[PDB]
Write a protein that binds this ligand. Sequence first.
Ligand code: CDL
Ligand code: CDL
Ligand code: CDL
Ligand code: CDL
Ligand code: CDL
Ligand code: PC1
Ligand code: PEE
Ligand code: LMT
Lengths: 62, 227, 96, 52, 85, 231, 168, 105, 78, 135, 103, 35
Amino acid sequence: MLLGGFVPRRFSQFNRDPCWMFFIFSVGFWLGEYPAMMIKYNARDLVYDPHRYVWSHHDDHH
Amino acid sequence: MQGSWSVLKKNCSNFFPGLLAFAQQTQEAYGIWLRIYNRQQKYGPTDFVEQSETFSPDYHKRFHSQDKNMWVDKELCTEVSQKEVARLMTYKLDMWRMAHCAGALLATGGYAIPFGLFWLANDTWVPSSFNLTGEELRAWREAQDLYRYRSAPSYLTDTKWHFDFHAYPWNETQERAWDDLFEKNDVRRDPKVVRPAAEMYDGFIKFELIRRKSLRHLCRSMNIPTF
Amino acid sequence: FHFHDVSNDAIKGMPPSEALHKHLENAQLAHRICLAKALKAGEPPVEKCALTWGEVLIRYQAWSEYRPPFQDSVAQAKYKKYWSKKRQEEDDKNPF
Amino acid sequence: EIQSRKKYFQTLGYLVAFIYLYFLMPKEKSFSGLSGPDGHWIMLPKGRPELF
Amino acid sequence: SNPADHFRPNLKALTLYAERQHYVDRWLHVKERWLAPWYLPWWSPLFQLGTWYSQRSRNLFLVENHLSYRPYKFRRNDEDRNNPY
Amino acid sequence: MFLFFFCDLFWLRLLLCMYYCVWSRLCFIVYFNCLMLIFDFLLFCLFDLYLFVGLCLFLLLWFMLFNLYSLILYYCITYLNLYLLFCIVFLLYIAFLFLFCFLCDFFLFNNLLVGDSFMDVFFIRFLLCFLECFSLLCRCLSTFLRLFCNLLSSHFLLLMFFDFFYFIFVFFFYGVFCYWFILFIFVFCFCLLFYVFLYLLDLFAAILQLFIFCNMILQLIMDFLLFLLFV
Amino acid sequence: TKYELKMQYFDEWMIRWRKFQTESDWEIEKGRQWWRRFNMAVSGALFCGLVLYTSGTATLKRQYGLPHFFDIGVDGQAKETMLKTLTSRWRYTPQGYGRVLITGVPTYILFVTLEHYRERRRMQQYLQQNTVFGEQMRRLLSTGKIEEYLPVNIKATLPASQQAIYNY
Amino acid sequence: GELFVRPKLEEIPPADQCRGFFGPLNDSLKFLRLLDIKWMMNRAVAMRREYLIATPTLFTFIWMFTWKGAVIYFWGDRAPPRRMDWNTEETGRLPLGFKPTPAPL
Amino acid sequence: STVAISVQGLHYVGTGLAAIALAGVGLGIGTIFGNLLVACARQPNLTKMLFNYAILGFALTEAIGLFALMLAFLMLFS
Amino acid sequence: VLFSTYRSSRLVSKEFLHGPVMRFRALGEYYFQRAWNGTLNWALPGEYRLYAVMIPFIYFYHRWHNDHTLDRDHVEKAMIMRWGGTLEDVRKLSAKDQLRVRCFTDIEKLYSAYGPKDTYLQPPGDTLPGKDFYR
Amino acid sequence: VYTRWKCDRLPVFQLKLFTQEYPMHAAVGIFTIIFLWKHMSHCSEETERKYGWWAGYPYWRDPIARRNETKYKQMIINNDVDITHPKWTGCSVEQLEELSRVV
Amino acid sequence: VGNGPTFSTGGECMNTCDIQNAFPMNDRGVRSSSP
Ligand SMILES: CCCCCCCCCCCCCCCCCC(=O)OC[C@H](COP(=O)([O-])OCC(O)COP(=O)([O-])OC[C@@H](COC(=O)CCCCCCCCCCCCCCCCC)OC(=O)CCCCCCCCCCCCCCCCC)OC(=O)CCCCCCCCCCCCCCCCC
Ligand SMILES: CCCCCCCCCCCCCCCCCC(=O)OC[C@H](COP(=O)([O-])OCC(O)COP(=O)([O-])OC[C@@H](COC(=O)CCCCCCCCCCCCCCCCC)OC(=O)CCCCCCCCCCCCCCCCC)OC(=O)CCCCCCCCCCCCCCCCC
Ligand SMILES: CCCCCCCCCCCCCCCCCC(=O)OC[C@H](COP(=O)([O-])OCC(O)COP(=O)([O-])OC[C@@H](COC(=O)CCCCCCCCCCCCCCCCC)OC(=O)CCCCCCCCCCCCCCCCC)OC(=O)CCCCCCCCCCCCCCCCC
Ligand SMILES: CCCCCCCCCCCCCCCCCC(=O)OC[C@H](COP(=O)([O-])OCC(O)COP(=O)([O-])OC[C@@H](COC(=O)CCCCCCCCCCCCCCCCC)OC(=O)CCCCCCCCCCCCCCCCC)OC(=O)CCCCCCCCCCCCCCCCC
Ligand SMILES: CCCCCCCCCCCCCCCCCC(=O)OC[C@H](COP(=O)([O-])OCC(O)COP(=O)([O-])OC[C@@H](COC(=O)CCCCCCCCCCCCCCCCC)OC(=O)CCCCCCCCCCCCCCCCC)OC(=O)CCCCCCCCCCCCCCCCC
Ligand SMILES: CCCCCCCCCCCCCCCCCC(=O)OC[C@H](COP(=O)([O-])OCC[N+](C)(C)C)OC(=O)CCCCCCCCCCCCCCCCC
Ligand SMILES: CCCCCCCC/C=C/CCCCCCCC(=O)OC[C@H](COP(=O)(O)OCCN)OC(=O)CCCCCCC/C=C/CCCCCCCC
Ligand SMILES: CCCCCCCCCCCCO[C@@H]1O[C@H](CO)[C@@H](O[C@H]2O[C@H](CO)[C@@H](O)[C@H](O)[C@H]2O)[C@H](O)[C@H]1O
């Protein structure tokens, strides 16, 4: 119902409560998984599967 | 009252004597009821004898009317004595419970035997005739009183809550009567002060409009089988 | 031996009883062929002919359930009522 | 008191169930067949030669 | 397609199969075992509740005389509209 | 065929056990109208008009545990099937309808014959009666269909938008370092705004649809209730 | 004797092997259906009669009194005749469980007895049949078990175009 | 909506006032009242017995929406085919030379 | 003769037709807001009830908009 | 007589596991039994910290389950179909090759309906194996 | 004072709730359950192949075939079924031996 | 003072609830959260 509870005023206060500490850790995970995906899936050495045209989900579900 | 092994032994020991006593009481009560029914049919009012129909104003469902479908035989003393009437009432209770049990037996064949064991282990639904001594009768009466204690408060609360949440008394005297009607038994209620509540509830709900849940609670409180 | 044709095109113009009997016969033929191969190899039949036996079983179940309707007063009345000259002619003058 | 004890036991049981479901239980009918059952028939007849 | 695949239960654990004939026969055996004893007369409401409706349904099935064909309930393939067999 | 699976509420069941081992007041109810059917005093009903409260509360709780938490990614609405919702609505609607019919009061249906004596009985009143008796079942069907399809459509849209957001965020963030960074920033701000808007809309609609799912049943009940006046 | 427990297996087998249902067995089943309908009709008539007899005097007066929906004249005459017939003599008019028992127990007993004896009659009919179903019924009553695939074991008659399977 | 009170015996109009499909079925036509459905509907409306029109309808719908709907869908007989596979009445009879088991005795 | 044909690009056509349903949705929202302004002009004090009812209806019109959008995506991505 | 229908027929002592139960109730009551924790139909509490804690946990365990149990099936199917159509054929590859294939599958998942269609549509003249490579 | 929810144990309260509080709902629920298990409790092999698998039917091992094989083997072994009987094969044992020698 | 809870309020403002009269009012004019 969103009635009350501890509300940090800014980022620096998220360490003033264990629940908000876990929340900021989770937010860090959420936002930091994106740069990791950028680096991993846009890497120079990444190569498409040579057999990618052998089979695809499009033919399977069709 | 919860079942017990001692009560089970008591009822098992007195099962056949109890049945014989019940049969004798059945004959006597049939005679008494025959007398009463003949008197009612002969001298009863036309509405009572013809079973006049009274329908509710909302869903037009028939139910007994207190004024028309109930008649007091002022001259019943000539044919039937007070003790006979009390005997008939007690036998009516016992016969109701025995009839329910017999119906269950007939319906379920031989599969009611364990349920019969559960039945004999408790004095709540056994006939009074199963008690052959004063102590057994006292325990049976205690069981009946326990059932009444279990059931009555629910009926009282149902009535009071429904009325108080859907209506209010008209005048101060009715307010006092309503408030004092539902006092605990520890205090003594003056019938004169409480009587106007009867008229007030007649204005709210008569016996012909009694709801099925309230009826079930009342039957529970009167030791009348409901299933 | 010869397997009957139970394709959709062949089945389209066939009575249900004939199709069921043909499927049953095909299943029996396949089962006996598998049994003959197993006997020639000398291996136990149960370890090789289970699926064919099950197919024969299911075809038997499907074949024994169907009883063609008896031609009687009410059945003929229904058939004539539904299939009037109008409807039969319209079908005759229609695709498929 | 009764409800506290019952809910303590229920909470422990639900915790165990949650762990098993979301971290140990394999999904049935896997494509590779490495995890989970593919299903099987039950209530099959036994000792009834006349049935066939 | 791929978005549509996201609306499936995510905690499927086991699947069991059983032919209708087998478990129907087992249920009939159980019912006969429980309704056989002498202390349950045939005229009792319980016995009639157990037997009469089933008898009526089976009789209705037997009397059935349909001009159309009803494909077998438990075929291997029922996804083909142009192949009732 | 017998499939063994489990609902997606085990953690929520654990939380309910942990937090509700002790009593707590409830003051905010999604559908409050099931507790206040009569607004004019001195009106009372002999029918069990408060029988729907328990079912209403349980249904609200169950559907809220499922739908509201389904916004969280990868959360599964285990009951999301058209015919399952049909079964639920059938149970509730037909149970109340059979409660009214078992009353064996035929006069209760007099209002079905719409209109007055001045209108042709066979060609006007009777047709409208047929249409209304059809409309009852249509109301049942409409309730179940609306409940199913609102959820399905909202979650389809959320999945599609999230896929687009992931695609652009992952494969086009490098534009921040390029000369066209402004376009990417504009697109990213637009996507964030749309993300917030979609989440708010889904949160509000999930609760509104339950209001309406319970309101349809309460309307069915009210269509056959008659109130007496105290005297 | 409990014929239903024996007959359920036979009925299920016949449904599974309905292909070999001769027209005689079909006629037997149709007669069983007709007798079930007749039993229902007679039980309903008995129930209606018991209900009418035990009905209260005021209830009868309201039901069989004015007004007349059609007012043809025959309707009123019949209603008056029935009302006079019912109200002339004294009738036991119980209410509550008593009326329920009086109206139902006779009806239930009649229906159950008729249906049980008709089931026995159908069992006898199937016993007297000279078809594969009759042989199956006799074997069931003798050995106590249903022998599935019996028609193909004893080579029951088949259409001229379906005798190849028996060719062994 | 509001409470319904049955009309008194004196408040019920006479049968002769009722109208049928074409016109009133008065003397010399009373027996036609049984066959005229519209006349019966008008009579019921006049006598405030409107339930006779509504109760059979609603119940019917329910009966269709609950029990007969699925029965027809799952076990109903579809239209017969053009070429009909009638029964030759050859199946079932025991073969020649077969010795059936004796009946119970 | 029996001929079976499988046209690929037709799914695009059905997608566009469903999108047309939004025309009756976007307009419906404008109608609600159009009435809202008039109502607020002649009952300024009772702005709370009017604004809430406007947003409640906007969700009961957006639902129908979501109804069509789902079919469009189904016929566009499948 | 065999079993009591009343909850008052205790099966254990009042002090059985008192300490652990009290600790459990202490955990339950500290954050929930508060004035500002006014629930909406028992489902949506008023405490912000409850959301802040539970939403991440629910997402984490759901995502772990999805990644390690649900999507794994699709990944394995793709690996099997694209590299021989049998599990042993896939196992004939090295761990690095399997990593490459699975990451390409993740690429396809991220692309979905907005990525280039050359990832599954073979352009004419392409020298890479076709669909009938293993047939 | 006595109250069903506070004094009765859970099974008893459940029976009371669904017998004297919501009996019609329980009856309709049982009716619907019976209907579902009588008409919506079967799945053909083709249906399972089309939709019965999360990622698709693995034709490269055909688990359905193995399942049916195990079923039929168990049935044959337990019930002592002679699969070589003429009814199963449609031909006599001697004809079967002749065919085996031929092929 | 301890950190224990009190009579539950359900997040309701007793100065505007439908049963406000059941909650006593103090000198400051703020109705109590408990009887
Ligand atoms: C074998 C076949 C079986 C078939 C299946 C049966 C399945 C079981 C169902 C139940 C059957 C009955 C069971 C026995 C009950 C005992 C007899 C009795 O009625 O007691 C009076 C008593 C009457 O109650 P009441 O409320 O006082 O009556 C108000 C009336 O106004 C009362 O009127 P009143 O105020 O004017 O006072 C009159 C009173 C005045 O009398 C007295 O006061 C004297 C006492 C008389 C009654 C004594 C009863 C004694 C009971 C105990 C018996 C011993 C048990 C021993 C057990 C241990 C054994 C080892 O006398 C009466 O009570 C007479 C009542 C009217 C007669 C009812 C009997 C009709 C059926 C019998 C005839 C059948 C003919 C078949 C013909 C076939 C043709 C083809 O019975 C009851 O308590 C009612 C029954 C309670 C259980 C109900 C269960 C549900 C029943 C649903 C049935 C639906 C129809 C059937 C189909 C079912 C499908 C699901
Ligand atoms: C020889 C004798 C003389 C001759 C015979 C005479 C005639 C005798 C018969 C007539 C007797 C009538 C009076 C009876 C009074 C006693 C009634 C009673 O039971 O009282 C409660 C009685 C105790 O009474 P009490 O302590 O005196 O307390 C009484 C109070 O006043 C408390 O009172 P209350 O009011 O609070 O209690 C009432 C409570 C009564 O209920 C209970 O209290 C529940 C009792 C059971 C509780 C079970 C709890 C334990 C569960 C264990 C589960 C398994 C655990 C694991 C086992 C592992 C084993 C290896 O609730 C009800 O009344 C509910 C009624 C529900 C009616 C249901 C109707 C359904 C109709 C269906 C719909 C139809 C619609 C129409 C459709 C039409 C379609 C055409 O309960 C017990 O004793 C519990 C027994 C538990 C036994 C063990 C568990 C079950 C074992 C099953 C074995 C199965 C073997 C075969 C398996 C085969 C598998 C293939
Ligand atoms: C052949 C392979 C095996 C399988 C055989 C299956 C046979 C099937 C026969 C044919 C059936 C045909 C029809 C099937 C229809 C299915 C429909 C369906 O599933 O719909 C979905 C639907 C999903 O429901 P749901 O929303 O998920 O909620 C149900 C949940 O149970 C949660 O709902 P709830 O929380 O409201 O439930 C109440 C809950 C209230 O909360 C709790 O009580 C908390 C605990 C919850 C437990 C239940 C959840 C299970 C979670 C997953 C499994 C947990 C880990 C198992 C580890 C296994 C490791 C191999 O209380 C309970 O559950 C009471 C049980 C508590 C047990 C506690 C045991 C403690 C033992 C301690 C021993 C200590 C020893 C010390 C020794 C020291 C020596 C020094 O399922 C159901 O509604 C139930 C379907 C059940 C149908 C009956 C099946 C027949 C019975 C099978 C029993 C097999 C036992 C043998 C297994 C042996 C291991 C392999
Ligand atoms: C109070 C209730 C409140 C709650 C209600 C809740 C429900 C809501 C309402 C809507 C319903 C929802 C549906 C829910 C599911 C329920 C189950 C369901 O649908 O199952 C259907 C389902 C239908 O069967 P099916 O398997 O689907 O397929 C049909 C098969 O043929 C099946 O084969 P079968 O062998 O079972 O056959 C059954 C047979 C029905 O029963 C039978 O087997 C035969 C008929 C039995 C008659 C019963 C007695 C009738 C009255 C006798 C007289 C009494 C007065 C005595 C005094 C007279 C003094 C003169 O049905 C038929 O097939 C039709 C037979 C037609 C015979 C008449 C032939 C036409 C010409 C003759 C009449 C026209 C004459 C005018 C000529 C022109 C003059 C100008 O099962 C049944 O219900 C049938 C079996 C049970 C029949 C019981 C028979 C007794 C009926 C007594 C009713 C009395 C009260 C009614 C009036 C009330 C006035 C106030
Ligand atoms: C294992 C066993 C299985 C058993 C299955 C059978 C069913 C269950 C059996 C019984 C279960 C026990 C409980 C039953 C309910 C008890 C109700 C109650 O407490 O009543 C108290 C009440 C006593 O209170 P009272 O103060 O003395 O009088 C009541 C007041 O009048 C009240 O005053 P009011 O102001 O309330 O007045 C209104 C009152 C006025 O009514 C009455 O109270 C009078 C009594 C009832 C009269 C019923 C007949 C009306 C005329 C029928 C005409 C039919 C003509 C058809 C012609 C066809 C020609 C082809 O009610 C009505 O207006 C209702 C009229 C009935 C409407 C029926 C609508 C049916 C719609 C069907 C829809 C479609 C169905 C499917 C399709 C079918 C076709 C294909 O009892 C009675 O009056 C009679 C009770 C009768 C109980 C039922 C007896 C059952 C017998 C079963 C025999 C067959 C067994 C088969 C077994 C099969 C193998 C297992
Ligand atoms: C890909 C294809 C998709 C197709 C989708 C189609 C829609 C599917 C929707 C499913 C979900 C929603 C279900 C809602 C509920 C539907 C209910 C329904 O129609 O079921 C009817 C069905 C019909 O039953 P039935 O199918 O067994 O009918 C038998 C009829 N014969 C024998 C002629 C074939 O009911 C049941 O399944 C329950 C039956 C048992 C319970 C009732 C017993 C009492 C019956 C009383 C009358 C008869 C006996 C005499 C009186 C009593 C004597 C004791
Ligand atoms: C009724 C049995 C009749 C025949 C005698 C069988 C005796 C078997 C030996 C039992 C020895 C252990 C007994 C331990 C005490 C049991 C107490 C008991 O039954 O309490 C039930 C109690 C629950 O009670 P409440 O509902 O909370 O309230 C009860 C107060 N009304 O149940 C339990 O907790 C389960 C206890 C199980 C104990 C073992 C029972 C074994 C019964 C077997 C019967 C079958 C015949 C055995 C023959 C054995 C021959 C060597
Ligand atoms: C308490 C009542 C006791 C009754 C005891 C017996 C009374 C005397 C016999 C009554 C008449 C029996 O005669 C009965 O006639 C009908 C035809 O009308 C036959 O019925 C035959 O033709 C009808 C025609 O519609 C078919 O539906 C039915 O399938 C077929 O069997 C019955 O098979 C036969 O049994």
